[PDB]
Design an enzyme around this catalytic site. Sequence first.
Site, PDB file in Angstrom:
ATOM      1  N   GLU A 116      22.209 -46.682 -99.187  1.00 31.98           N
ATOM      2  CA  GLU A 116      22.287 -46.480 -97.676  1.00 31.98           C
ATOM      3  C   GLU A 116      21.033 -45.174 -97.635  1.00 31.98           C
ATOM      4  O   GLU A 116      20.283 -45.367 -96.481  1.00 31.98           O
ATOM      5  CB  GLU A 116      23.601 -45.643 -97.029  1.00 31.98           C
ATOM      6  CG  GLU A 116      23.677 -46.199 -95.808  1.00 31.98           C
ATOM      7  CD  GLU A 116      22.810 -45.280 -94.997  1.00 31.98           C
ATOM      8  OE1 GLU A 116      22.663 -44.063 -94.884  1.00 31.98           O
ATOM      9  OE2 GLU A 116      22.127 -45.965 -93.881  1.00 31.98           O
ATOM     10  N   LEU A 173      28.156 -35.190 -94.952  1.00 36.52           N
ATOM     11  CA  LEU A 173      28.148 -36.780 -94.934  1.00 36.52           C
ATOM     12  C   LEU A 173      29.318 -37.023 -95.527  1.00 36.52           C
ATOM     13  O   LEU A 173      29.911 -36.544 -96.480  1.00 36.52           O
ATOM     14  CB  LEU A 173      26.958 -37.475 -95.780  1.00 36.52           C
ATOM     15  CG  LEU A 173      25.603 -37.340 -95.014  1.00 36.52           C
ATOM     16  CD1 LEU A 173      24.526 -37.988 -95.899  1.00 36.52           C
ATOM     17  CD2 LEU A 173      25.533 -37.564 -93.703  1.00 36.52           C
TER      18      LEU A 173
HETATM   19  N1  LIG Z   1      26.050 -39.824 -90.764  1.00 36.22           N
HETATM   20  C1  LIG Z   1      24.910 -39.699 -90.468  1.00 36.22           C
HETATM   21  O1  LIG Z   1      23.722 -40.690 -90.334  1.00 36.22           O
HETATM   22  C2  LIG Z   1      24.441 -38.154 -90.235  1.00 36.22           C
HETATM   23  C3  LIG Z   1      25.502 -37.193 -90.160  1.00 36.22           C
HETATM   24  N2  LIG Z   1      25.352 -35.862 -89.837  1.00 36.22           N
HETATM   25  C4  LIG Z   1      26.601 -34.972 -89.719  1.00 36.22           C
HETATM   26  O2  LIG Z   1      26.568 -34.477 -88.443  1.00 36.22           O
HETATM   27  C5  LIG Z   1      27.377 -32.991 -88.596  1.00 36.22           C
HETATM   28  C6  LIG Z   1      26.397 -31.970 -88.092  1.00 36.22           C
HETATM   29  O3  LIG Z   1      26.581 -32.207 -86.473  1.00 36.22           O
HETATM   30  P1  LIG Z   1      26.284 -30.991 -85.555  1.00 36.22           P
HETATM   31  O4  LIG Z   1      27.165 -29.853 -85.978  1.00 36.22           O
HETATM   32  O5  LIG Z   1      27.083 -31.784 -84.274  1.00 36.22           O
HETATM   33  O6  LIG Z   1      25.031 -30.382 -85.506  1.00 36.22           O
HETATM   34  P2  LIG Z   1      23.439 -30.718 -85.230  1.00 36.22           P
HETATM   35  O7  LIG Z   1      22.942 -31.121 -86.577  1.00 36.22           O
HETATM   36  O8  LIG Z   1      23.447 -31.592 -84.135  1.00 36.22           O
HETATM   37  O9  LIG Z   1      22.919 -29.179 -84.917  1.00 36.22           O
HETATM   38  C7  LIG Z   1      23.558 -28.743 -83.750  1.00 36.22           C
HETATM   39  C8  LIG Z   1      22.488 -27.627 -83.322  1.00 36.22           C
HETATM   40  O10 LIG Z   1      21.298 -27.951 -82.878  1.00 36.22           O
HETATM   41  C9  LIG Z   1      20.475 -27.184 -82.101  1.00 36.22           C
HETATM   42  N3  LIG Z   1      20.502 -27.967 -80.898  1.00 36.22           N
HETATM   43  C10 LIG Z   1      21.249 -28.782 -80.270  1.00 36.22           C
HETATM   44  N4  LIG Z   1      20.609 -29.211 -79.096  1.00 36.22           N
HETATM   45  C11 LIG Z   1      19.646 -28.633 -79.019  1.00 36.22           C
HETATM   46  C12 LIG Z   1      18.452 -28.906 -77.945  1.00 36.22           C
HETATM   47  N5  LIG Z   1      18.723 -29.590 -76.744  1.00 36.22           N
HETATM   48  N6  LIG Z   1      17.617 -27.995 -78.030  1.00 36.22           N
HETATM   49  C13 LIG Z   1      17.289 -26.925 -79.224  1.00 36.22           C
HETATM   50  N7  LIG Z   1      18.407 -26.793 -79.917  1.00 36.22           N
HETATM   51  C14 LIG Z   1      19.404 -27.709 -80.014  1.00 36.22           C
HETATM   52  C15 LIG Z   1      21.665 -25.909 -81.998  1.00 36.22           C
HETATM   53  O11 LIG Z   1      21.392 -25.017 -82.908  1.00 36.22           O
HETATM   54  P3  LIG Z   1      21.445 -23.329 -82.969  1.00 36.22           P
HETATM   55  O12 LIG Z   1      23.028 -23.413 -82.894  1.00 36.22           O
HETATM   56  O13 LIG Z   1      20.933 -22.790 -83.962  1.00 36.22           O
HETATM   57  O14 LIG Z   1      21.060 -22.992 -81.514  1.00 36.22           O
HETATM   58  C16 LIG Z   1      23.179 -26.608 -82.227  1.00 36.22           C
HETATM   59  O15 LIG Z   1      24.077 -25.906 -82.447  1.00 36.22           O
HETATM   60  C17 LIG Z   1      27.273 -32.729 -90.162  1.00 36.22           C
HETATM   61  O16 LIG Z   1      28.780 -33.147 -90.601  1.00 36.22           O
HETATM   62  C18 LIG Z   1      26.464 -33.553 -90.625  1.00 36.22           C
HETATM   63  O17 LIG Z   1      26.830 -34.509 -91.927  1.00 36.22           O
HETATM   64  C19 LIG Z   1      23.914 -35.351 -89.491  1.00 36.22           C
HETATM   65  C20 LIG Z   1      22.743 -36.171 -89.871  1.00 36.22           C
HETATM   66  C21 LIG Z   1      23.156 -37.696 -90.194  1.00 36.22           C
HETATM   67  C1  LIG Z   2      24.707 -33.960 -93.782  1.00 37.78           C
HETATM   68  O1  LIG Z   2      24.056 -33.374 -94.730  1.00 37.78           O
HETATM   69  C2  LIG Z   2      22.903 -34.203 -95.162  1.00 37.78           C
HETATM   70  C3  LIG Z   2      22.212 -34.404 -96.409  1.00 37.78           C
HETATM   71  C4  LIG Z   2      20.892 -35.192 -96.676  1.00 37.78           C
HETATM   72  C5  LIG Z   2      20.649 -35.283 -97.990  1.00 37.78           C
HETATM   73  C6  LIG Z   2      21.596 -35.458 -99.006  1.00 37.78           C
HETATM   74  C7  LIG Z   2      21.390 -35.410-100.440  1.00 37.78           C
HETATM   75  C8  LIG Z   2      19.850 -35.695-100.622  1.00 37.78           C
HETATM   76  C9  LIG Z   2      19.443 -35.770-102.218  1.00 37.78           C
HETATM   77  C10 LIG Z   2      18.906 -35.543 -99.534  1.00 37.78           C
HETATM   78  C11 LIG Z   2      19.379 -35.401 -98.442  1.00 37.78           C
HETATM   79  C12 LIG Z   2      20.342 -35.918 -95.599  1.00 37.78           C
HETATM   80  C13 LIG Z   2      21.137 -35.686 -94.225  1.00 37.78           C
HETATM   81  C14 LIG Z   2      20.274 -36.278 -92.932  1.00 37.78           C
HETATM   82  C15 LIG Z   2      19.046 -35.597 -92.545  1.00 37.78           C
HETATM   83  C16 LIG Z   2      20.520 -37.795 -92.931  1.00 37.78           C
HETATM   84  C17 LIG Z   2      20.833 -39.052 -92.758  1.00 37.78           C
HETATM   85  C18 LIG Z   2      21.088 -40.225 -92.498  1.00 37.78           C
HETATM   86  C19 LIG Z   2      21.149 -41.176 -93.532  1.00 37.78           C
HETATM   87  C20 LIG Z   2      21.577 -40.705 -94.913  1.00 37.78           C
HETATM   88  N1  LIG Z   2      21.295 -42.459 -93.180  1.00 37.78           N
HETATM   89  C21 LIG Z   2      20.957 -43.014 -91.984  1.00 37.78           C
HETATM   90  N2  LIG Z   2      21.071 -44.477 -91.911  1.00 37.78           N
HETATM   91  N3  LIG Z   2      20.736 -41.983 -90.999  1.00 37.78           N
HETATM   92  C22 LIG Z   2      20.681 -40.802 -90.929  1.00 37.78           C
HETATM   93  N4  LIG Z   2      20.226 -39.995 -90.288  1.00 37.78           N
HETATM   94  C23 LIG Z   2      22.130 -34.871 -94.034  1.00 37.78           C
END
Ligand SMILES: NC(=O)C1=CN([C@@H]2O[C@H](COP(=O)(O)OP(=O)(O)OC[C@H]3O[C@@H](n4cnc5c(N)ncnc54)[C@H](OP(=O)(O)O)[C@@H]3O)[C@@H](O)[C@H]2O)C=CC1
Ligand SMILES: COc1cc(-c2ccc(C)cc2)cc([C@@H](C)C#Cc2c(C)nc(N)nc2N)c1
Length: 225
Positions: A30, A23
């Site tokens: 948040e 993140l």
């Molecule tokens: N701001 C926010 O609310 C959030 C942000 N993020 C951010 O996103 C980034 C990560 O995203 P990203 O790298 O795109 O990775 P993902 O978390 O989306 O993981 C991608 C992986 O999921 C698996 N996958 C994808 N599609 C499929 C499918 N259709 N079926 C089965 N498996 C699938 C594959 O795993 P495999 O390679 O093992 O086969 C792929 O490499 C990080 O920077 C993180 O911080 C994450 C959550 C929340």
């Molecule tokens: C990318 O690294 C990550 C770290 C955490 C995390 C980080 C710290 C702690 C104590 C617990 C969990 C959670 C996440 C994911 C699962 C998320 C999220 C998400 C959010 C914070 N806000 C909103 N609005 N939507 C989300 N999907 C990703």
Amino acid sequence: KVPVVGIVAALLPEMGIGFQGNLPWRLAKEMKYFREVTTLTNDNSKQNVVIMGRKTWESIPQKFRPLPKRINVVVSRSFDGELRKVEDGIYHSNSLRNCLTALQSSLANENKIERIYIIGGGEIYRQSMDLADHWLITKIMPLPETTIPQMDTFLQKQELEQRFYDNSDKLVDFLPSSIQLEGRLTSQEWNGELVKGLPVQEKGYQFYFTLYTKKLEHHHHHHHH
Ligand SMILES: NC(=O)C1=CN([C@@H]2O[C@H](COP(=O)(O)OP(=O)(O)OC[C@H]3O[C@@H](n4cnc5c(N)ncnc54)[C@H](OP(=O)(O)O)[C@@H]3O)[C@@H](O)[C@H]2O)C=CC1
Ligand SMILES: COc1cc(-c2ccc(C)cc2)cc([C@@H](C)C#Cc2c(C)nc(N)nc2N)c1
């Protein structure tokens, strides 16, 4: 039959969501919102599902996973099929789509999932535009003297605003009823875009909790036997 809700924190105007597997900010408020929304249910005997890609799972700190009080599903193309219990609170799936169909079977689920939250990351969100009924997007904005953080992963805002409309007027009503928000609903212009939702500020950022809902569809075909 069970609602599928993507939930995400995104930095305007590009809707950046990550950088280098993490993140791009650390916002306790948040994160509290995310926790409460995904954990809480209106029905006390149900839980929510959280579904996430493998890379997202691997970035959650190990003390904090699996996310408590929610069914966690991790998707990887190297997993066995379509929904398998691998540990207490952890299911593996090799398929986002088939995992969703599986979770929706009332025979499997006993009608005890309330909602299914899709919690990231970039890859998973790209694929979820056609799967989600709603999006809970936290719209994040750097305050005037805040450095914009570097980012490398983005929500598909084009496809977003294609399929969904800003339904933030109904946000409060859509959230599980025990959640408590400190803002009141608020429309603000920012860099040429309407930002509507429930304001917070923390550290160098202002953010709004918003709700996006699927636009009305024309009736082109219903399947008949
Ligand atoms: N701001 C926010 O609310 C959030 C942000 N993020 C951010 O996103 C980034 C990560 O995203 P990203 O790298 O795109 O990775 P993902 O978390 O989306 O993981 C991608 C992986 O999921 C698996 N996958 C994808 N599609 C499929 C499918 N259709 N079926 C089965 N498996 C699938 C594959 O795993 P495999 O390679 O093992 O086969 C792929 O490499 C990080 O920077 C993180 O911080 C994450 C959550 C929340
Ligand atoms: C990318 O690294 C990550 C770290 C955490 C995390 C980080 C710290 C702690 C104590 C617990 C969990 C959670 C996440 C994911 C699962 C998320 C999220 C998400 C959010 C914070 N806000 C909103 N609005 N939507 C989300 N999907 C990703």
